[PDB]
Amino acid sequence: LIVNVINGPNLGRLGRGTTHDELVALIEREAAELGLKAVVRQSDSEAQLLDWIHQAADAAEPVILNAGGLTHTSVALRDACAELSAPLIEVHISNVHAREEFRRHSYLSPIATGVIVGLGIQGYLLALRYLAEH
Amino acid sequence: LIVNVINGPNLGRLGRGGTTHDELVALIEREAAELGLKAVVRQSDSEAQLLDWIHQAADAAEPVILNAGGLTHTSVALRDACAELSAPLIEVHISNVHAREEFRRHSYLSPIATGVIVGLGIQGYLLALRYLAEH
Amino acid sequence: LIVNVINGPNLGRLGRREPAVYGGTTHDELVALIEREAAELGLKAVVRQSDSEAQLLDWIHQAADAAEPVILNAGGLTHTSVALRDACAELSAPLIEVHISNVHAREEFRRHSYLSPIATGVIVGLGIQGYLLALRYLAEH
Amino acid sequence: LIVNVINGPNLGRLGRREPAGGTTHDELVALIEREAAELGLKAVVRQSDSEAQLLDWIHQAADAAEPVILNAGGLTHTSVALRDACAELSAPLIEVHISNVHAREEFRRHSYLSPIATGVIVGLGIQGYLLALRYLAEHVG
Amino acid sequence: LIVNVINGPNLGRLGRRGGTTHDELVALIEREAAELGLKAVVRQSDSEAQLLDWIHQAADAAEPVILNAGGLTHTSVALRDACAELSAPLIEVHISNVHAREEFRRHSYLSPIATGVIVGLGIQGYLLALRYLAEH
Amino acid sequence: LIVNVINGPNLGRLGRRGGTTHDELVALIEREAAELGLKAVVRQSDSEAQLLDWIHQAADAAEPVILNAGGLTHTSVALRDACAELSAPLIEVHISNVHAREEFRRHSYLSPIATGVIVGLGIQGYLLALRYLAEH
Amino acid sequence: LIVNVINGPNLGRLGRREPAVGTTHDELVALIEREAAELGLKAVVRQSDSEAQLLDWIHQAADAAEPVILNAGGLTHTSVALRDACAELSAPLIEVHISNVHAREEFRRHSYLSPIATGVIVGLGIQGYLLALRYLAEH
Amino acid sequence: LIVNVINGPNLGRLGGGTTHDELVALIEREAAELGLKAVVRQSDSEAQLLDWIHQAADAAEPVILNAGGLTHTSVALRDACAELSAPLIEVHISNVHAREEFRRHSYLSPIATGVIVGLGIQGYLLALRYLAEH
Amino acid sequence: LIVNVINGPNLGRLGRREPGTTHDELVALIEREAAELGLKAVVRQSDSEAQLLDWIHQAADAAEPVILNAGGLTHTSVALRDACAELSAPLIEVHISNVHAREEFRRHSYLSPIATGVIVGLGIQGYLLALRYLAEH
Amino acid sequence: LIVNVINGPNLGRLGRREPGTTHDELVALIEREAAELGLKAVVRQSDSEAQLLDWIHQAADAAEPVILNAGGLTHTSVALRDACAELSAPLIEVHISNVHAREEFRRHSYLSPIATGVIVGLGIQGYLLALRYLAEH
Amino acid sequence: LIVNVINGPNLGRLGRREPAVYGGTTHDELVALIEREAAELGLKAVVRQSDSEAQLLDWIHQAADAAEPVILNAGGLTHTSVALRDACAELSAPLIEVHISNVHAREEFRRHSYLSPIATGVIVGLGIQGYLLALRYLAEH
Amino acid sequence: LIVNVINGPNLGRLGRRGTTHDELVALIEREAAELGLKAVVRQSDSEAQLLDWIHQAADAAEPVILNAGGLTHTSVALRDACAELSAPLIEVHISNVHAREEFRRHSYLSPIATGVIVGLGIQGYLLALRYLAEH
Ligand SMILES: CC(C)(C)NC(=O)C1=C[C@@](O)(C(=O)O)C[C@@H](O)[C@@H]1O
Numbered sequence A: 001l002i003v004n005v006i007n008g009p010n011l012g013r014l015g016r017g018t019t020h021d022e023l024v025a026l027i028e029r030e031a032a033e034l035g036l037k038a039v040v041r042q043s044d045s046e047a048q049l050l051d052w053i054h055q056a057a058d059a060a061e062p063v064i065l066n067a068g069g070l071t072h073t074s075v076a077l078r079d080a081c082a083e084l085s086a087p088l089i090e091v092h093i094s095n096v097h098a099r100e101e102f103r104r105h106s107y108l109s110p111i112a113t114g115v116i117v118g119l120g121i122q123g124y125l126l127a128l129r130y131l132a133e134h
Numbered sequence B: 001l002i003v004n005v006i007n008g009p010n011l012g013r014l015g016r017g018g019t020t021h022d023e024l025v026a027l028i029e030r031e032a033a034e035l036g037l038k039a040v041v042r043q044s045d046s047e048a049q050l051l052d053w054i055h056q057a058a059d060a061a062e063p064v065i066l067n068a069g070g071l072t073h074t075s076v077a078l079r080d081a082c083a084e085l086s087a088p089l090i091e092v093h094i095s096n097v098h099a100r101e102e103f104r105r106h107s108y109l110s111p112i113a114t115g116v117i118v119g120l121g122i123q124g125y126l127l128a129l130r131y132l133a134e135h
Numbered sequence C, K: 001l002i003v004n005v006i007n008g009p010n011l012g013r014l015g016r017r018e019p020a021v022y023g024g025t026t027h028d029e030l031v032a033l034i035e036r037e038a039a040e041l042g043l044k045a046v047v048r049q050s051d052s053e054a055q056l057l058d059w060i061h062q063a064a065d066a067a068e069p070v071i072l073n074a075g076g077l078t079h080t081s082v083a084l085r086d087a088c089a090e091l092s093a094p095l096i097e098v099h100i101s102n103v104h105a106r107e108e109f110r111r112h113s114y115l116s117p118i119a120t121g122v123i124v125g126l127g128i129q130g131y132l133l134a135l136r137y138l139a140e141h
Numbered sequence D: 001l002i003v004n005v006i007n008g009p010n011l012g013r014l015g016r017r018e019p020a021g022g023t024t025h026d027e028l029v030a031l032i033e034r035e036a037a038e039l040g041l042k043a044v045v046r047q048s049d050s051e052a053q054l055l056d057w058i059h060q061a062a063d064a065a066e067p068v069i070l071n072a073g074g075l076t077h078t079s080v081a082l083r084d085a086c087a088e089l090s091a092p093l094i095e096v097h098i099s100n101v102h103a104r105e106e107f108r109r110h111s112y113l114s115p116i117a118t119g120v121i122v123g124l125g126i127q128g129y130l131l132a133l134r135y136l137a138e139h140v141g
Numbered sequence E, F: 001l002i003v004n005v006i007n008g009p010n011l012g013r014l015g016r017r018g019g020t021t022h023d024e025l026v027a028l029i030e031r032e033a034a035e036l037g038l039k040a041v042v043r044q045s046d047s048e049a050q051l052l053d054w055i056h057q058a059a060d061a062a063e064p065v066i067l068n069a070g071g072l073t074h075t076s077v078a079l080r081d082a083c084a085e086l087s088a089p090l091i092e093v094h095i096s097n098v099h100a101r102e103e104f105r106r107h108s109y110l111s112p113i114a115t116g117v118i119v120g121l122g123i124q125g126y127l128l129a130l131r132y133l134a135e136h
Numbered sequence G: 001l002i003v004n005v006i007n008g009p010n011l012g013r014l015g016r017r018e019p020a021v022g023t024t025h026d027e028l029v030a031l032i033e034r035e036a037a038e039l040g041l042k043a044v045v046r047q048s049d050s051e052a053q054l055l056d057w058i059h060q061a062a063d064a065a066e067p068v069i070l071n072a073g074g075l076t077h078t079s080v081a082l083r084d085a086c087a088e089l090s091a092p093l094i095e096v097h098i099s100n101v102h103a104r105e106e107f108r109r110h111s112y113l114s115p116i117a118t119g120v121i122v123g124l125g126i127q128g129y130l131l132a133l134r135y136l137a138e139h
Numbered sequence H: 001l002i003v004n005v006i007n008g009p010n011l012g013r014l015g016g017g018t019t020h021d022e023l024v025a026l027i028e029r030e031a032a033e034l035g036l037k038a039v040v041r042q043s044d045s046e047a048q049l050l051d052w053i054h055q056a057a058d059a060a061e062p063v064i065l066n067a068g069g070l071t072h073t074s075v076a077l078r079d080a081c082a083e084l085s086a087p088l089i090e091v092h093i094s095n096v097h098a099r100e101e102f103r104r105h106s107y108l109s110p111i112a113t114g115v116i117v118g119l120g121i122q123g124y125l126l127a128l129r130y131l132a133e134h
Numbered sequence I, J: 001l002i003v004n005v006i007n008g009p010n011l012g013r014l015g016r017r018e019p020g021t022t023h024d025e026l027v028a029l030i031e032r033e034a035a036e037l038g039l040k041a042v043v044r045q046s047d048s049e050a051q052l053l054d055w056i057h058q059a060a061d062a063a064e065p066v067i068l069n070a071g072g073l074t075h076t077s078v079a080l081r082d083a084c085a086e087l088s089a090p091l092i093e094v095h096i097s098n099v100h101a102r103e104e105f106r107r108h109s110y111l112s113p114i115a116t117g118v119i120v121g122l123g124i125q126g127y128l129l130a131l132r133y134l135a136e137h
Numbered sequence L: 001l002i003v004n005v006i007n008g009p010n011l012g013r014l015g016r017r018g019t020t021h022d023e024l025v026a027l028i029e030r031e032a033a034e035l036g037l038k039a040v041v042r043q044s045d046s047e048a049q050l051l052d053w054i055h056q057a058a059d060a061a062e063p064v065i066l067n068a069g070g071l072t073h074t075s076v077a078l079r080d081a082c083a084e085l086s087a088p089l090i091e092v093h094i095s096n097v098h099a100r101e102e103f104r105r106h107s108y109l110s111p112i113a114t115g116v117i118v119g120l121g122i123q124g125y126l127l128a129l130r131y132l133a134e135h
């Protein structure tokens, strides 16, 4: 079982210490320990994210998805996640509820399986672990 | 190394998915020992009772996993008692509070919580425990 | 048929003071009225009052386990509690929300209820007569 | 003596529509009379899709000072004219809804009438017209 | 004259994890009461039912209440309704300034039916309120 | 310690259409001040600019303010920023209970930057504010 | 010139049977008609509870290019149809209300008519209609 | 096949540039060519409109409806239309979204099959043609 | 029979582009029309809210009617509303232009709920008509 | 007599996907129907906003009508709107689902205030009717 | 060319104890900083401060009667005064709204200006340079 | 010392389709040089291209002048990119965003921008440049 980890705009800037690279590695280590294969990609492009989403729908694979700012603004991304037949675990590194009010809304939580927020980089790992079971 | 798992109003009714509360306590207790932790699991429908327990977790500096039930959207009192905690606080909803009624999408707890796990059913707890075992 | 009538916070203070509202029937009288009417309708009616949320829920859980119907006047909780709603949403038997006053002729916040959407039905603003009428509805089913 | 029971837009389509309960307006009209009659009352039961017609009926009830049981259909949530007419009723006015309006769209959870009404019965279905009658039967003010 | 000072949720934890613990508040209220020539009873509970009970007693005893409701202030229609019954004065007391915290603390279900409200003059709101009452 | 008591629009009209009038109020306040080993300057204006002038002076002099802004309470940003400068305590006072009136009287621009707020305690509010200042 | 005075819903119920808020509809027609006489205009005063009926009278005025004094009662706060009918008028339109709408329920503070009318008189009692006439006489 | 076209309040006063009669003519001419029968009526009276809606419900015939102002106000009308088992196309001649803010809400749209706005008079004809194809 | 016609910020500027009566012409036209009705019109304008309040206070104590057009303050001043609140004689709010045919913000008046009546969009004429009303009550 | 049919994000997943007509299938009908009407139909789909804008910039430059089903971008993009606002010839907004019968947030669009018109809830055929409208200017 | 610079309430308090801040260039040093940079561009800066709305309004009128440009920092009034807005709206010559601090980084109430929609433009957050950038704009058109 | 003038969606299309984007680039450049800075001006319709450019200004600690277009009102991902700048960022708009539609009166950028200039036409760009010369 392949799991798709899709980091959205800005997450390449992670740590600018836990860099995006340290994230990618860290995820693959728990991935392989869980008897899973994680494919982690990031892009600042909404088009690109939509497309990785489309693929994972065609391939019936779960998606762990940290969309960054697009979480609060984008119906298109929501609509592409809605076709996922497999589980979708939305993730935030930071507690989105402790910050600005507009971050407390997510177009994604309603069509997602579960949501992990403010647990730091481990959100992802704990998400993989869930997807091991379903 | 104690951990407090606290469940509020109505959680005493799980299983009437099919996991009873009695069952879930056991799950957590066992899962917790596997990670070297000691889980104290408790449930009450009484908002005062949850306060005494959250008060004790403040004094002991023990971490809390809190599923507050309906109190999540409603009790500013609970929030305040919780804002006092110094060890982590992980808010947990069994169901995806975000795919239900509009009013379940506000939490009073979330802003003072370390983090929040939603929609992952019973595993939400075991995950919270795992995070506690690392940090 | 056992019918549960559950009254929330402050309801033990009926008619005795707040006598404007209200109306003038004390809680003890209301118990008697409701029992009397239950008898003519051929139902047994257990009536119970409490300012404690934990106690109301525990009565509602029991109602849910017995699949007995419920006539609930939740007091202030109507407008505020989600736990209680969540308890009530569990009942298989019918749920009738009763308010003595006309919650729509008063403060704007009384005009909203967490309970109303998950109840069979609602009676508002007919005084103590609203408990008995609700009994009537159950007698028919 | 005399209660006016009034039904606004689309209650002529009761039944029937669709169906969804099965009771027609014609049968509901007979049910209400029967029931009123069993109580010592006489029930004049009309329905109209015309707001003007409804205001004519309400005016008369006011001039005669007869009580009014109103199920105003969609008009519950939109009509300020209907409201100001009812407002001048001196006899009890009891607003009715067959279905639980708080269990539906949001625009349904506001009534222009609930505040100027004696009370409100919602979601006890057809029986809500009879229970209204029983309230009137047990008073005269 | 007996004033009733009723502290709500979390208020038993003052001083623990203002400057002043609940014990010292009690100690202070006692002296100020004796300065004023009143009797005051100070009570604290995190139970809303317990709170309602005490208010009821005041309601039947025609006695003044000083109420610091904690979070219940912003959320409880039950407590507002119990309090609206009261015939002697009710003064709502907040130790912190509520209007300088989160936006939701700026709404109180009590202010509308209280005689008045003292906000964010710290523990001295209790004393200043007992004073208002001593002068009725 | 000098204390400023500042009174905004309409407060000149107290008791002209309860009872107690502005002159009388000045005097009770003056009386309470002396009794508290304090000196009180009470003033009244219907002019926002004049009120700003008085607030500027009290910030320069680092003197305590007791402020009853009247209608400006719910409308003036300008007034709020003047008051933001005070280093000595600011106490907001309303004679009436502003939470049991029109909805728009329940928003104050001043409360958030005030030390505290006393509402609905009548004229006694001023004298509870003086007494608060009189401690620390 | 001619001036149309139009009263909507519940307005035939003026006076006693709605005490204060004090004249009957008939008496109001008498007042309005005599004041128009002196002003040198003829007033056509009609009341109806039918939104349908109001629109036709309103269409007829847009046709005749006559001015309109409208008291729409509760439809003031609810009816787009009625507003779109008045939007059509080439002569002046004066909304009238007998009571002060701003001193009652919140929902009365909004008018769908106001933005398309020439003006609005509110709370001046029955004189509203007369003051409105006076306005029209002058233009 | 029968298609009911219902014009609401104020529609008897068109002039698009065409008058209401020019409009019946036009919907009839077009209705013919698609192999349909269009009944086109107009009332300023809600009662009449609800009645015309009931008939169409009973006879299970499609409805093209331009409710005018009632679009934005009437729960009664919306409930009458909810009864229909055959399609209902809501139709506004002007672009209701390029005028006042209130015109941008409709009670009918959520219950209709679809909506056509802004295409002028010719919007009736496009509705007719959708119905040709069912 | 004295009548207070009080005008607020900016009405000094009636001029002047346009919809073409000046303030001085307004005062005079109002003073002569009030005399035709056998009243005395006392027409005063200020940009100063305090000045406006002072004149409300006097009208309160004199029990004289007030015609007020409070300009921008209509939409913003609780202070003014509260001065107006205490009048005992009639208070007619007037606006020259149709306030409802304009910015959303202009459609709320703080004075309306405590006034006797309001007249809006009737041009300079709204004044004259409020004098007529005042002659009767 | 050229007409642009632009389809925004996700629309190339038609009939894949809530099984009924695929995107290629739909390009086909539109040309079939367009020809039948004596106009030429250029039909594009893209998930990238910047690309959709390019196409809109091109249509405005060309003075050629557009028929736009913007997908999700309908409810969120101001930049899409300003692009579209530049067209001097008919724009027709089109949706396949009835946007009003779903989530509240689907019920506002940034396009409708600048579109020539809107067609909603009428399936693939909406593209066709838009086309038909356009073939009369 | 005369440019009128106008500062509303509290701007007399710049520098000390201006806070802000906590400095601090003093309203006097500002006047100096502006007439200088105005001369350099060949303009005449008439810089004024008043805590009094009626005073502000009157400076606004004369500018209108004189067709002269205005750079306005209206302080608290920005957010609250329709009177001030309407005075400014009669300006034939340009109007630039200047705020020293970044209004969008402070309280929500500061993010609304009654002045911006009738102003040529607004400069915000750039400190005391805001005024000079404003004179600059005016020196071109 | 480098200033990064960034232009967003539809801004490629100033001119007729007076100043074109071409002319605006020359103006910015002349002015910048006449002030002792070099202005790198750029346009894009692509949210992802602008983020990229922002990230680079963050890495260089170079100031940014940004006219984000309609993305001013809608993009939180853009805002977060700018939160990262340690040097000044001036938001620019040619038109008056407050004299237009209501939705244009909210900026996700304003809060994190050092400053904001609005409605001063193409000149707003050069005044922002001037601002930066003197830090
Ligand atoms: C690089 C950084 C600025 C931290 N990323 C983000 O933008 C964001 C982080 C998040 O995804 C996160 O917490 O993982 C939340 C989201 O609201 C925000 O857009």
Ligand SMILES: CC(C)(C)NC(=O)C1=C[C@@](O)(C(=O)O)C[C@@H](O)[C@@H]1O
Pocket (backbone or CB within 6 Å): B009, B010, B011, B012, B013, B014, B067, B068, B069, B070, B072, B092, B093, B094, B095, B096, B097, B104, C082, C083, C086, C087
């Ligand atoms: C056991 C049950 C009755 C379902 N508890 C709850 O009411 C609730 C549970 C939740 O916390 C939960 O998802 O775990 C959500 C909350 O909104 C809800 O009120």
Ligand SMILES: CC(C)(C)NC(=O)C1=C[C@@](O)(C(=O)O)C[C@@H](O)[C@@H]1O
Pocket (backbone or CB within 6 Å): C009, C010, C011, C013, C014, C018, C021, C022, C073, C074, C075, C076, C077, C078, C098, C099, C100, C101, C102, C103, C110, E077, E078, E081, E082
């Ligand atoms: C005895 C009294 C205090 C009046 N009971 C109540 O609290 C209440 C009565 C109600 O249930 C009632 O109207 O029946 C409504 C509720 O809003 C309110 O809190």
Ligand SMILES: CC(C)(C)NC(=O)C1=C[C@@](O)(C(=O)O)C[C@@H](O)[C@@H]1O
Pocket (backbone or CB within 6 Å): D008, D009, D010, D011, D071, D072, D073, D074, D075, D076, D096, D097, D098, D099, D100, D101, D108, H075, H076, H077, H079, H080
């Ligand atoms: C317009 C009409 C068809 C009458 N609508 C109804 O039937 C309705 C049913 C109800 O009246 C009813 O419960 O009887 C409630 C009301 O919201 C709704 O309008």
Ligand SMILES: CC(C)(C)NC(=O)C1=C[C@@](O)(C(=O)O)C[C@@H](O)[C@@H]1O
Pocket (backbone or CB within 6 Å): F008, F009, F010, F011, F068, F069, F070, F071, F072, F073, F093, F094, F095, F096, F097, F098, F105, I078, I079, I080, I082, I083
């Ligand atoms: C406008 C003005 C006349 C000043 N109003 C008052 O007097 C007021 C009195 C108060 O300050 C007071 O309670 O003393 C309350 C305030 O809301 C009100 O504005």
Ligand SMILES: CC(C)(C)NC(=O)C1=C[C@@](O)(C(=O)O)C[C@@H](O)[C@@H]1O
Pocket (backbone or CB within 6 Å): D080, D081, D084, D085, G009, G010, G011, G013, G014, G018, G021, G071, G072, G073, G074, G075, G076, G096, G097, G098, G099, G100, G101, G108
């Ligand atoms: C005759 C009476 C029932 C009093 N009329 C009215 O209700 C109404 C008329 C009004 O237009 C009026 O004041 O003239 C106000 C409106 O809100 C109300 O519906």
Ligand SMILES: CC(C)(C)NC(=O)C1=C[C@@](O)(C(=O)O)C[C@@H](O)[C@@H]1O
Pocket (backbone or CB within 6 Å): G080, G081, G084, G085, H009, H010, H011, H013, H014, H066, H067, H068, H069, H071, H091, H092, H093, H094, H095, H096, H103
């Ligand atoms: C005055 C007239 C334009 C005739 N009124 C209408 O017909 C209307 C019909 C509309 O559906 C239409 O544009 O076709 C829109 C509606 O808001 C408007 O009231």
Ligand SMILES: CC(C)(C)NC(=O)C1=C[C@@](O)(C(=O)O)C[C@@H](O)[C@@H]1O
Pocket (backbone or CB within 6 Å): I010, I011, I013, I014, I069, I070, I071, I072, I073, I074, I094, I095, I096, I097, I098, I099, I106, K082, K086, K087
């Ligand atoms: C002198 C001028 C600027 C035209 N006046 C006004 O702005 C105003 C006067 C008004 O009373 C008026 O319409 O007459 C109302 C108010 O909204 C507005 O501020």
Ligand SMILES: CC(C)(C)NC(=O)C1=C[C@@](O)(C(=O)O)C[C@@H](O)[C@@H]1O
Pocket (backbone or CB within 6 Å): A075, A076, A079, A080, J010, J011, J013, J014, J018, J069, J070, J071, J072, J073, J074, J094, J095, J096, J097, J098, J099, J106
């Ligand atoms: C292709 C699929 C993702 C199923 N469609 C849509 O969700 C959408 C497309 C629509 O433009 C459409 O109905 O064609 C509507 C819009 O709300 C939504 O983004």
Ligand SMILES: CC(C)(C)NC(=O)C1=C[C@@](O)(C(=O)O)C[C@@H](O)[C@@H]1O
Pocket (backbone or CB within 6 Å): F077, F078, F081, F082, K009, K010, K011, K013, K014, K018, K020, K073, K074, K075, K076, K077, K078, K098, K099, K100, K101, K102, K103, K110
């Ligand atoms: C002098 C100082 C006290 C800082 N002035 C201000 O309060 C203000 C001035 C401002 O225009 C300014 O930013 O310069 C903003 C405004 O919101 C605020 O009231």
Ligand SMILES: CC(C)(C)NC(=O)C1=C[C@@](O)(C(=O)O)C[C@@H](O)[C@@H]1O
Pocket (backbone or CB within 6 Å): J078, J079, J082, J083, L009, L010, L011, L013, L014, L067, L068, L069, L070, L071, L072, L092, L093, L094, L095, L096, L097, L104
């Ligand atoms: C000039 C044009 C190409 C139309 N640009 C814009 O769309 C925009 C420019 C703006 O940033 C501007 O004018 O500076 C405002 C913004 O809301 C809008 O998106």
